[PDB]
Amino acid sequence: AECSVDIQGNDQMQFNTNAITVDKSCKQFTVNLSHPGNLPKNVMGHNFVLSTAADMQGVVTDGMASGLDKDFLKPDDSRVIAHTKLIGSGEKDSVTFDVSKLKEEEHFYFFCTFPGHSALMKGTLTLK
Numbered sequence: 001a002e003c004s005v006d007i008q009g010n011d012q013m014q015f016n017t018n019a020i021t022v023d024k025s026c027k028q029f030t031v032n033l034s035h036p037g038n039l040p041k042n043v044m045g046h047n048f049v050l051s052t053a054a055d056m057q058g059v060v061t062d063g064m065a066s067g068l069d070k071d072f073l074k075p076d077d078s079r080v081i082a083h084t085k086l087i088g089s090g091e092k093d094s095v096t097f098d099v100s101k102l103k104e105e106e107h108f109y110f111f112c113t114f115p116g117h118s119a120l121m122k123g124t125l126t127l128k
């Protein structure tokens with residue numbers, strides 16, 4: 001169907017949704033992230049990061065360590081299926097990935113890796 005979704009992260013430390021469905025029809029899928037709240041990236045930055053459920057903890061933990069200059073993400077992290085930039089108020093970023101990379105598993109988690117964020121900024125992404 002539509003092979004894109006528009007996601008927002010804000011000042012409430014929440015994305016607007018906790019569930020994304022990707023139409024199995026799609027060869028590619030695009031996630032357009034924007035920040036409709038008011039703070040900078042160095043403080044209340046969000047990114048969108050996609051992994052298997054099992055990999056999320058490692059991604060979030062290795063992320064924190066990497067620091068704000070690496071967008072709180074380990075560079076070249078092979079667990080990460082798709083990722084955007086870290087963004088603050090009124091910035092945006094997009095990421096496109098192959099639907100084939102979701103063939104093998106069931107429940108994936110999307111999440112923000114800014115330290116602490118993933119307490120609320122965790123959702124499920126599935127292939128339907």
Ligand SMILES: [Cu+2]
Pocket residue numbers: 009013044045046047112113114117121
């Ligand atoms: Cu965040």
